[PDB]
Amino acid sequence: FASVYAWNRKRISNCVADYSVLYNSASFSTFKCYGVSPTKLNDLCFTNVYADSFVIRGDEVRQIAPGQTGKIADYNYKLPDDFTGCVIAWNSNNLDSKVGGNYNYLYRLFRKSNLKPFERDISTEIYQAGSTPCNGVEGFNCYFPLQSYGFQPTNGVGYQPYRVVVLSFELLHAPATVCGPKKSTNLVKNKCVNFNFNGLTGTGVLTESNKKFLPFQQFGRDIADTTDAVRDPQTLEILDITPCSFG
């Protein structure tokens, strides 16, 4: 994973996202959704999803939430006050903690001012608590600003490492982007059915035809502009549409 003071930032993009494999995986110790309850994720579409990743203590997972305070949310990773995404977290004691202490997971414990939301700060300047200038050397009131979790496998829960992923769905002003899956089914012929091809919605009886579209053409229509043929998006075969008998 990535440190807590330099989190990662992956920009998930146009894709088919299935938040159900996440939501029901039961391996997550914390799955909170804020802008939107979890079950309705696989039924919405946004412009971008960002995923941030890092590793913290066990009992600092309650500062990854909109409107908190503490050494993590103050200056390591700040969530805006109208967050929209979801926060996922699971214990990882066996992967990240090693006998003798894993001193490779640091965090920032001194900063001039709390972070703006989603702001990031990887500098390593000597912090200056008192009024006396520091001149790049340590001493009283001149402190190195990074400390390290010394993780060890015999730590009580709440001191063992937890891995955290923060999904943030954003909606700028584009034309569209990633959304949740879309079902599908077999196709029966010679019966009055309710069909739906990609958004073409109607009812009638579908037969096989003797037309020949052009490779980019997706459905046909006649004079008076009624749909009388269609292409189905998996066989690449065109089908005649006939209204279901009436009188």
């Epitope: 503490g70 050494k71 050397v137 340590e138 001493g139 009283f140 402190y143 190195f144 400390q147």
Partner: antibody, heavy 125, light 113 residues
Framework: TLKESGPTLVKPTQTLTLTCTFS??????????VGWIRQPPGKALEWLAL???????RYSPSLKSRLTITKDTSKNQVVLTMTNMDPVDTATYYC???????????????????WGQGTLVTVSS | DIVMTQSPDSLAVSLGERATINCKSS????????????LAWYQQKPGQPPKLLIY???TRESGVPDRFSGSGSGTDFTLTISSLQAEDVAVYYC?????????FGQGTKLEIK
């Protein structure tokens, strides 16, 4: 793992080096030091001198004139020379290993963390 | 200057019993930029130096029994030693770097009843 080596009975007014021989750690990385302490009998303790990783030396302002420290990361020691012996300095002389002065709101310098043992000093002719 | 006034002097605590020592700093010694107290408890064995028992007032040192544990708030600072063993005939200290001079606890007689 510190240990303060030194002579046991002293005579007045002369300068006196002092050796806190340690091991188990070095003494030149950002966040490390060793503070030197005395305590006369019945009194509370008195830290005397200190030196950090890039040799940031501290002393008591009263015997700033007489205390003169230097760290020995190589020997895992610290040399502190100290002048003007007098019988009210009849103390046993300690060293204590500083670590991450970010924690520094807990001890009044009196202690620290490591701490060796101490070489006794008595002022008698 | 923030004087550290101990709790129980000639403590006649029985064997295996909760021995209590309070420390009353005269001022609130909390560095509020930590959300965590600092205090260093110490054990002078007679003829021996005081050794660090609990730093951060909640983070016990290595190799130390967890039957000793630290507590306290604001200006009152207690010590939750749950059991007084036969090894506990010693002298004890509490202090604060959150000051200027060498403030001190005064030291307690640990008679084992």
């Amino acid at each position: 793992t510190l240990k303060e080596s030194g002579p046991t009975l002293v005579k007045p007014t002369q300068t006196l080096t002092l050796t806190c021989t340690f091991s188990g750690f070095s003494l030149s990385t950002s966040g490390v030091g060793v503070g030197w302490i005395r305590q006369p009998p019945g009194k509370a303790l008195e830290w005397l001198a200190l030196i950090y990783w890039d040799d940031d030396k501290r002393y008591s302002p009263s015997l700033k004139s007489r205390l003169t420290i230097t760290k020995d990361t190589s020997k895992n020691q610290v040399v502190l020379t100290m002048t003007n012996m007098d019988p009210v300095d009849t103390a046993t002389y300690y060293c204590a290993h500083s670590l991450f002065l970010t924690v520094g709101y807990s001890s009044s310098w009196s202690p620290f963390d490591y701490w060796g043992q101490g070489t006794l000093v008595t002022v008698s002719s | 200057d923030i004087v550290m006034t101990q709790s129980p002097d000639s403590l006649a605590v029985s064997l295996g019993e909760r021995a209590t020592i309070n420390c009353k700093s005269s001022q609130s010694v909390l560095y509020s930029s930590n959300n965590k107290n600092y205090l260093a408890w110490y054990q002078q064995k007679p003829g021996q130096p005081p050794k660090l028992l609990i730093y951060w007032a909640s983070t016990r040192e290595s190799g130390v029994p967890d039957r000793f544990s630290g507590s306290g708030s604001g200006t009152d600072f207690t010590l939750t030693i749950s059991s007084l063993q036969a090894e506990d005939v010693a002298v004890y200290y509490c202090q604060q770097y959150y000051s200027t001079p060498h403030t001190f606890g005064q030291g307690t007689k640990l008679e084992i009843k």
